[PDB]
Design a protein around this ligand. Sequence first.
Ligand SMILES: O=C(c1ccccc1)N1CC(O)C1
Ligand SMILES: [Zn+2]
Ligand SMILES: [Zn+2]
Ligand SMILES: [Zn+2]
Ligand SMILES: [Zn+2]
Lengths: 286, 131
Amino acid sequence: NVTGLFKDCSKVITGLHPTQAPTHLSVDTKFKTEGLCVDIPGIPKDMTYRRLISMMGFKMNYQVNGYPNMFITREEAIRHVRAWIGFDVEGCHATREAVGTNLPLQLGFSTGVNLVAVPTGYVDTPNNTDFSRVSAKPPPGDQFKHLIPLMYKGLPWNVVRIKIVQMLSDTLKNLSDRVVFVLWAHGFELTSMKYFVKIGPERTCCLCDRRATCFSTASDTYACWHHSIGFDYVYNPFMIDVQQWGFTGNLQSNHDLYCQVHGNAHVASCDAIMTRCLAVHECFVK
Amino acid sequence: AGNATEVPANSTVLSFCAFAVDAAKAYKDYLASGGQPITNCVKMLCTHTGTGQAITVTPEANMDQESFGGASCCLYCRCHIDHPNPKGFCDLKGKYVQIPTTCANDPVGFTLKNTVCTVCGMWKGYGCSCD
Ligand SMILES: O=C(c1ccccc1)N1CC(O)C1
Ligand SMILES: [Zn+2]
Ligand SMILES: [Zn+2]
Ligand SMILES: [Zn+2]
Ligand SMILES: [Zn+2]
């Protein structure tokens, strides 16, 4: 029994030395005997590897005192309709030195904003995990051809996450004390959130009594949407996956049952607008 | 394509700690709310006649310890997140770590909560000959 979370996507034929492998599964077979591992004199550690580790497959089903649930019920989401932001991500595929994982490329929101990131992954090395640019290509097919020019228009993730926090803060500061990301088939959106979301216990802002919605790695401080200028992470967001409400078929076919004003322009922001629109029609119309 | 590194019993705890502002506090809180410790560590077979020093080049478990692969006992290596060290490098990856047998059910939690004496090389409270 294995999971795809933290799958090693490198093309290295062998596993790791016992001192460098993060897990027993990832140790090379040559060291495995009698149910455990052995150190073998004369078999050295590898001092130059770069192994891409997949961030697909997160499971946010913990129940830890004082930490809020990220995924919320339809009833809780309805009460916080003013906090709804549709979110969709179009990815690119690892290539060359790695294969088998998707990296965020175009991040789209129901505000109409599309942000483009440099293809970046989590690469294990002999000393740490290096969050770095990795070789990538858009998926093949005419439905994905629009992503080709985006491979050279990306911004570094330290810039993209600041822009996400600024956009959310500007949109929501007079609407809600939180954000509820409205998703359709959430797996890749949750993988993309690893790049710009942090979690922890509920906190209050560094300048008022409002709950904290943002975090700064510069000062290790917390802010609400009003006081988050310069903050780089979204803190304790909420989310809901609309696809889990009983719909069959794709996003567009279900969106089109209630709405005709949102034509499919085939972009992350358009999928994010259709997802929020479908949720609004399903919960509030008629 | 690719090769799995993890088992499903660790998905929840690793996801929780991978997103936390404070991963060490999140792991401690996860255990206090009844969660299971991280499993699938690299436990070594050895002769239990070693020096007993905490962090070593080869397994050095004495009869009161077990030896593990160092990266596998490091929360930051297991979650693929930043290390707290100034330059962001790991002091356990590429070494073996000796853990008291009484604590070997949770090697990741042990390394998070304990300190190595710089003078004698043994864990403070679990072998240190200085105090
Ligand atoms: O033993 C492993 C391994 C590497 C990384 C993660 C898990 C297992 N390999 C032999 C070669 O096909 C890759
Ligand atoms: Zn505030
Ligand atoms: Zn619509
Ligand atoms: Zn480490
Ligand atoms: Zn000492």
